[PDB]
Amino acid sequence: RMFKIEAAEIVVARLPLKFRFETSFGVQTHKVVPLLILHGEGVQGVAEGTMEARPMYREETICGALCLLRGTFLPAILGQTFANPEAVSDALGSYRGNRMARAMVEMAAWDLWARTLGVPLGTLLGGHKEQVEVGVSLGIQADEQATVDLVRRHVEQGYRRIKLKIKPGWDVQPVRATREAFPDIRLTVDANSAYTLADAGRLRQLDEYDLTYIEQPLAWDDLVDHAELARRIRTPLCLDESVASASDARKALALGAGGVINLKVARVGGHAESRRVHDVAQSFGAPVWCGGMLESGIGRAHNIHLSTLSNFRLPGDTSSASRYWERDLIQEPLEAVDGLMPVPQGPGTGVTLDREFLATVTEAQEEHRA
Amino acid sequence: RMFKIEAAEIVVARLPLKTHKVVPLLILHGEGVQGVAEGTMEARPMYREETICGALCLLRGTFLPAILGQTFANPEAVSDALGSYRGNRMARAMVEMAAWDLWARTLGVPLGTLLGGHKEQVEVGVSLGIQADEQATVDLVRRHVEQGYRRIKLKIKPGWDVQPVRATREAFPDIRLTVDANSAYTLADAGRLRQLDEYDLTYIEQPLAWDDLVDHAELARRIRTPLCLDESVASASDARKALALGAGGVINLKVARVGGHAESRRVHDVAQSFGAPVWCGGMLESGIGRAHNIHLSTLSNFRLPGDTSSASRYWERDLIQEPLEAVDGLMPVPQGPGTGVTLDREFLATVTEAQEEHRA
Amino acid sequence: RMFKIEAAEIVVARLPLKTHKVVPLLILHGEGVQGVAEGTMEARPMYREETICGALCLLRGTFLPAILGQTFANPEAVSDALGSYRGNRMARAMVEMAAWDLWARTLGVPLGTLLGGHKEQVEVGVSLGIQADEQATVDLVRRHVEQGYRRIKLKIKPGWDVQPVRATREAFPDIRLTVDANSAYTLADAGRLRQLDEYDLTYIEQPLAWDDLVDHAELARRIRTPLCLDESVASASDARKALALGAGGVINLKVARVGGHAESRRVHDVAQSFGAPVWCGGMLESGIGRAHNIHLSTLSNFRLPGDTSSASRYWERDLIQEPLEAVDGLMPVPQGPGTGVTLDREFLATVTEAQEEHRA
Amino acid sequence: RMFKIEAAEIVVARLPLKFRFETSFGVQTHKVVPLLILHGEGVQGVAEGTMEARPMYREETICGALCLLRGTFLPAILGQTFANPEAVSDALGSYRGNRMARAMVEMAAWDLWARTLGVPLGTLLGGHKEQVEVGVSLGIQADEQATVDLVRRHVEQGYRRIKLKIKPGWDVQPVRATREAFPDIRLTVDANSAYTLADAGRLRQLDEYDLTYIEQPLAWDDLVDHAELARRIRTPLCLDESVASASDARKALALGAGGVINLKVARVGGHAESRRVHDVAQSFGAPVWCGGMLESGIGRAHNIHLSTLSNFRLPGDTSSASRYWERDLIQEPLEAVDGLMPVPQGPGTGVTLDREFLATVTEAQEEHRA
Numbered sequence A, D: 001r002m003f004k005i006e007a008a009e010i011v012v013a014r015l016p017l018k019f020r021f022e023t024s025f026g027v028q029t030h031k032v033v034p035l036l037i038l039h040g041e042g043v044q045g046v047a048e049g050t051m052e053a054r055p056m057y058r059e060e061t062i063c064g065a066l067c068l069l070r071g072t073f074l075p076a077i078l079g080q081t082f083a084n085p086e087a088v089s090d091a092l093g094s095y096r097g098n099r100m101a102r103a104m105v106e107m108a109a110w111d112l113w114a115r116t117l118g119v120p121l122g123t124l125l126g127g128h129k130e131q132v133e134v135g136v137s138l139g140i141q142a143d144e145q146a147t148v149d150l151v152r153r154h155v156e157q158g159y160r161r162i163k164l165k166i167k168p169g170w171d172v173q174p175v176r177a178t179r180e181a182f183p184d185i186r187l188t189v190d191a192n193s194a195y196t197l198a199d200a201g202r203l204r205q206l207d208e209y210d211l212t213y214i215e216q217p218l219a220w221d222d223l224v225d226h227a228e229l230a231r232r233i234r235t236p237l238c239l240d241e242s243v244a245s246a247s248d249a250r251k252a253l254a255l256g257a258g259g260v261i262n263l264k265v266a267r268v269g270g271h272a273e274s275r276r277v278h279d280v281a282q283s284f285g286a287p288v289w290c291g292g293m294l295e296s297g298i299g300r301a302h303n304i305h306l307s308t309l310s311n312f313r314l315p316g317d318t319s320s321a322s323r324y325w326e327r328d329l330i331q332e333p334l335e336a337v338d339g340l341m342p343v344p345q346g347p348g349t350g351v352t353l354d355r356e357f358l359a360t361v362t363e364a365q366e367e368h369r370a
Numbered sequence B, C: 001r002m003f004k005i006e007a008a009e010i011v012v013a014r015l016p017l018k019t020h021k022v023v024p025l026l027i028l029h030g031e032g033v034q035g036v037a038e039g040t041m042e043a044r045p046m047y048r049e050e051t052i053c054g055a056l057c058l059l060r061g062t063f064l065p066a067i068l069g070q071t072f073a074n075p076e077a078v079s080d081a082l083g084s085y086r087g088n089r090m091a092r093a094m095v096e097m098a099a100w101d102l103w104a105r106t107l108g109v110p111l112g113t114l115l116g117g118h119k120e121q122v123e124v125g126v127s128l129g130i131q132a133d134e135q136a137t138v139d140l141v142r143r144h145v146e147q148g149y150r151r152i153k154l155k156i157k158p159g160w161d162v163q164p165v166r167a168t169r170e171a172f173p174d175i176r177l178t179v180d181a182n183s184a185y186t187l188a189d190a191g192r193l194r195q196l197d198e199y200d201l202t203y204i205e206q207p208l209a210w211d212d213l214v215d216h217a218e219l220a221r222r223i224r225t226p227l228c229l230d231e232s233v234a235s236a237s238d239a240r241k242a243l244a245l246g247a248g249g250v251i252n253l254k255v256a257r258v259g260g261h262a263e264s265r266r267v268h269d270v271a272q273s274f275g276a277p278v279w280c281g282g283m284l285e286s287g288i289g290r291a292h293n294i295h296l297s298t299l300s301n302f303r304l305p306g307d308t309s310s311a312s313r314y315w316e317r318d319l320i321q322e323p324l325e326a327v328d329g330l331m332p333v334p335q336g337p338g339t340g341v342t343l344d345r346e347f348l349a350t351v352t353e354a355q356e357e358h359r360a
C-alpha cells in the first residue's frame, strides 16, 4: 500500500578514480557522488546524482541541483503520502528542465517503494533478464597501434562492445587500426558532440569499418542536423545528450536523427521516464543501451536493474565497478564476467551503502524533514 | 518474490443482458491467490478476427500448458513465455491480464497503482446508437448530459451523420461530442465527413477500413475533424505508425485488443510521447473486464472519457460482488488488491454453460 | 585597444514592485569604466531551466575566475573564453552583456550603435493578463489603445481564448493584436486555435511545449494564424531550425535567454534572412535590463513592438538614475555610452540583500 | 560618437600582375583597382572595388559602378552625419543589385568609422583571431604531372589548401594526379560555373579523390540545379557567385545547394552583410571561407579582418601579396608564412596607401564634396 516519506538525507562524497577519463569535453580523474536517501515505512531508497560540479557533459550542476532539492523538491514531498513513484514525480510541480535533479528524488522513490514491497527494482519495471551484456568505453589514448592494445586488454576480458571516444583530429585511425587487430569485435565510437555537418565526409570513412553506431557526433542539443548527417552516412547514429525525455525520443526517431539511443536513466529524469523512452524506441524498432556516468555502486545498480528491460538489445557502459574505484560506496561487488553483469540480488536495487566507509569520504551531509 | 502458476480454470458464462452474452473467464491460481481476466472475442469474428472457439483452443492446447507449473518474476515474464505465436491478442490478453491480477494480489497492491496510475476516479462517456430522427437524438443527449456524462458519442452512418451531429451541437454548443463511424465510409465520403468540421467534434472514430492506417492518413489531410483509431491499433508499434503517419490524433485504447495491460501502457506511453490522448474503449464487459478497464484508465494520458459506465446499464446482475456504478460521469476505482473485485462464485455457477480445470 | 577585466561584483537586490523581485546584477570593472548586466533567471525554474542559486554558483566558481585578470579584444572574446560549458545561457548572458556595456564605455559609444542599430526610439506594446469577462478585456484594451501602445498582447488559456480575442477585434478592427498562449495547449486544440484565424492576430505565442519546435511546425500547418516562438529559440541555430521547419513566422527575442547581445544579433539576422520579424520580449527587468533591451531593440528587424514599456509600471523606484518612460508607444533610447543608464548606488544599497567582490 | 563624411575621392589605378590568371571565363594578366577614399573627422576610410572592366565574373562593371557612385551613392552621403556604417548603408536608398558598388561605400565607411574609434576593423565585426589560414588557388595549367609541380611549389610553402581551377575538358586528371603526389593535402576545385546537370556523372568521379568541396560547378546565378547536383555526388558543393546576400545564403542552404560558402565581402555588399552571411551559414552548420579577387593590399587587408570571424573555418584565397604584385599600393607587407596570414596592425584595416607610388599608377582621380 501507500508510503509516507518522512526524512531525506543529502550526502556528498568524493571518490578517487583509477584510470584518467579524457573525453572531448575534458579530462576526468576524480568523482563527486551526490547521494539522496529517502526514509519511509521502516525502509530507505537511495539514489545518486549524475550532475557535475561544472556543466561540461550537459547543463546541470551539483550546486544548482542541491538548491533545487532543498528549496523545492524535498519540501514538496516531505511528510506526504504516495501510492507509487509516479505520484512522487507528479508532486514536483511543473518546473522546467533539471531532469537529473528530479531523477535523484524519483529514483530514490523507486528504491524506497520496491523495498516496501520486498521486490527487486527491475522486476517492477517489467524486466526479467537475470544478467545484462556490457561493453567498455575507452577514453582518448596514445596512437594507432599503441591503443589497439588497450582494446586488447578488454577483448581478452570478454567485453561485448568496445567504444572509442574520438574527437576532431583523432578518429578514423583507431577504427581501421582496431578493426585491424580485431576484425570481428562489436565496435563503436563516441564522436563526442565534437563535429558539425562540415565534418560529414570524414565521418563517412568510418563506414567500411563496420561500427554498430557513431554516438552523438553533432551538437549535444541537436536533432535536426543529426537527421541530415544520418542521410549522408551508412553507419547508424546513436543519440545521447539530445534525448532527455520520451517525447525527445519520439521526435528524434520520427525525424531520423538516429537509429539507436544511449539511455541514461538520470538524464531523462528517472526510471519511469526511462521505461517510456525504452518503449518509444522499441515501437520504432530502435534499440537502446545503457549509458554510464562513472557511477558509484548505487548508480551502477540502478542502471543494471533498468537494463533488464527487453529493448536493451545492445551492450551498455555498465562495466565492472573494480575498474573505477579501489573501494565502492556499497558492500556488494558489481563485477561483470565475459561481458555479462549479474543483477545484484535483494529488494529494490539489491545493494547496500557501506556507511562506515561512506563516512570517511563524505564532504557534506544534511537531513531534511517536514 | 516470484510466483508459480499452479492451476487455471476456464469458465464460460451466459450472462443475461438487461438475450444473453457469453462471458469467457480465465482464473489463474498461485501463491494462495488468484487472478481473473475476461475474454472479449465473440462467437463469430465481427468486431475483429478472433473467436471464443479459436481462443479457448489456443488457451488449453498452447498457452496454458506453456505456463502451468512455471514460476515467474512478473506478468511480462508470463507473456514472454508465449511470444512465439502470432496475433491472437485477445486470447493472449486473457492470460496476461489474469497474470497482472494474480501478481498484484501476491503483493497486496491495486493493479492501477502497479501500472503507474494514481487517479481515484475515472471520467466516463456515453455511447448512443442511431435514433429515428434529429429531435429523438437531442432528447437522449439531453438525458445523458443531465446524468453528468463528460462525453457524448453518437453512432453515425452514411445517410445519417451531419443531421444528428448538427441537431446535437445546436442544442449543446459546448459539450464534448464525438461520433463512431464504424468503418462504414470510404474516401469518396471525404466531402460529407468534412461537413462535420463546423460542429467541432473531438474526433471521428475509425471511419474507414477496420485494419487500415494509410487511407485514414489520407482522409485526415482532407478534413479538419480529428480521427480516432480503434481496430487498427493492436500494439505499441501500430500506435507509433498510426501517429507518425497522421492516421489519427486519438486512440480508442482497448486493453484486450492490444494484448493486455503491459502493451496497453506502452500504447498509452507512445501516444503520450506524441502528445496524443488515449481513452478507454468498451466491449460490453462483465465486472471483471470493467474493473480491469477502470484500473488501466487511471493512467495519466487517459485524458478523454472512457466506456466504463455503470455495470447496471448492461446487467440485471453482475458476476462480481462489487457494484461498479458511475455517479455524475465519474467511476470510482474499485478498492482492494489487483482489480479490487471478486467473483460471486455461486451466482456465477447459476449462469455457467461450461467450466474446466487445468494443471501442469 | 583591448580591455582587461580587473574586478567583478555580484549584487543581489530585492526591489519592491508597485511583494518584491530579486534582481541579480553583475558589474565588471576595467579600464576605468564598468559594465553592468542583470540576470533574468528566477529563484525556481519556472519560465525556463535556470535558477539564481545555480547561476551565481556558475559565475563565482567558473565564469568569473575564467575572465578575471584577462585582457580581451571584444565581448565576443570574453564569451569565447567561456565556451566549454553547456547551456546556462542566462548565467552566460550576465557576463556577456556586462562585457558589451564595459566595452562600449571604453570606446565612448552607445551600445545599440555598436551592435548596428540606428533607431532613436523603439515601439512598445502592452501585455494584459486574463480578465474576468469580455467587456472587462475590451475596457482595458481601450485604455491601452488610448495610451498609444502599438501592440496589444492578450494572455489566453484553454476555456478563454476565442471570447476575449473576438470581443477585442469587434471593438478594435484595425489594431495590432496578439495573444500569449503560455504553452497551455496541445495538438488536440488545433480546431479551437484555428477559430482565432478569423480575427487576424499577428501571432500566437508559444501555444505548445516550451522547448518544442517540431509539434509547433505541425500546428502551423493546421491553422493560418502565425506562430511566434519564445522559449524554444535559445540560439541562432534554434532560430534557423525553427524558421526552416515552419515552427513559426515570428520570434519573441529575449537577450539573456539566447546568451546575450552577440547571439541576439545573430538570432535577429537569421530571422531577417528568412524575412521573419523579431520583437523584444520582457522579463520584468529593472532599468539595467530594460536599457540593455531598448538598445538591442534599435536593430532593424525588430519590426514588431517590444515589451520595454515604462519602468514606472513595475517599480515604485528603479535601480538606475535615469527614467525609462515611454510616451505614445515610443520608448526613447537612453543617451550615453553603453546602455546609457547609471546605477543609483545609494538607493541600490538600501535594497541589497547580498553583495560580493571578486578579483583574479 | 557620430561621423560626418565631408569628401570622397575616386582613384583608379592599374597594377601589372605577375602570374597569368587563366580562369574558365578567360585569361587575366593585368589589374584595374578602383579605390574609394572617404574623409571625415580628421581620418580616412579606403575601400577597393572588385568589379571588372567587363562583366566576366559577375554582372557589374567599373564603368557602371562609378556612374552609380558619382551620380547617386556619393550625393546621398556627402555632408551627412552617421552613427555607424549601417546608417551609411541605410542612406543609399532602395536601389537594386549593384552590391560591389555599394560595398565600396560601405567598406570605406567601416574603415573610416573604426579609425575614428582607434580600433581594428575585425575587432568591431566580432573577430578575435590573430591570424588566418590561407590556401592558394591555381589557375589553369600545363598537364597531368607537369602541373602536380606547381602544386608542389605551394605545398612546400605551407599553404593550407590547394585549389585547382578546372573546366569542361580539363578536370578529373589533376585531381587523381595531385592526390597522386599529395595524397594528404586539403584539395579543392573551382569547377568554374562551367558545367550543367548534363556534366553530373563525370563530376562524381572527383568523389574518391577526397576534395573538401567543388566550387560553383553550375550557372553563376543558380541555386536550384546545384541542390539537384548535390544529391547526385558525395563531394560537398561550395557556392560563390550565387550567394550575393544573407537571404541568398539562407535560401541556398535551406535548399541544399551547397555545404560551404565562398564569402566575398564586396560581392555580398560589404562587411555588415558579410557578417550576416557568415552567421546565417554558421546557424546551418556550414563553414565559410574568404574568396579573393586579385586585390591590392587595401582589398586584401579588408579580407583579412573579415576572416578573423569564427565561422571562417576553411582556408581562404588570401595568399601573399608578393605573389601578385612587384609593388602593392600600400606600405605594409601582407605576407603569409606556413599558410598563416597575420592581421595587419593598426586602426581600421591596419594598412596605409603609398600615395607617392599610387600616383605613378593612377589613371583617373576625382574629388566629390557636398
Ligand SMILES: CC(=O)N[C@@H](CCC(N)=O)C(=O)O
Residues within 6 Å of the ligand: A023, A057, A137, A291, A292, A293, A294, A295, A317
Ligand atoms: C561522467 C560521464 O560523463 N562519463 C562517461 C560515462 C562513463 C561510464 N563508463 O561509466 C560519458 O561518456 O558520459
Ligand SMILES: CC(=O)N[C@@H](CCC(N)=O)C(=O)O
Residues within 6 Å of the ligand: D023, D057, D137, D291, D292, D293, D294, D295, D317
Ligand atoms: C578577379 C577574380 O575573379 N579572380 C579570382 C580570385 C583571385 C584570388 N587569388 O585573389 C577568382 O577566382 O574569382
Ligand SMILES: [Mg+2]
Residues within 6 Å of the ligand: A190, A215, A240
Ligand atoms: Mg558517451
Ligand SMILES: [Mg+2]
Residues within 6 Å of the ligand: B180, B205, B252, B281
Ligand atoms: Mg466506439
Ligand SMILES: [Mg+2]
Residues within 6 Å of the ligand: C180, C205, C252, C281
Ligand atoms: Mg509574451
Ligand SMILES: [Mg+2]
Residues within 6 Å of the ligand: D190, D215, D240
Ligand atoms: Mg573562384
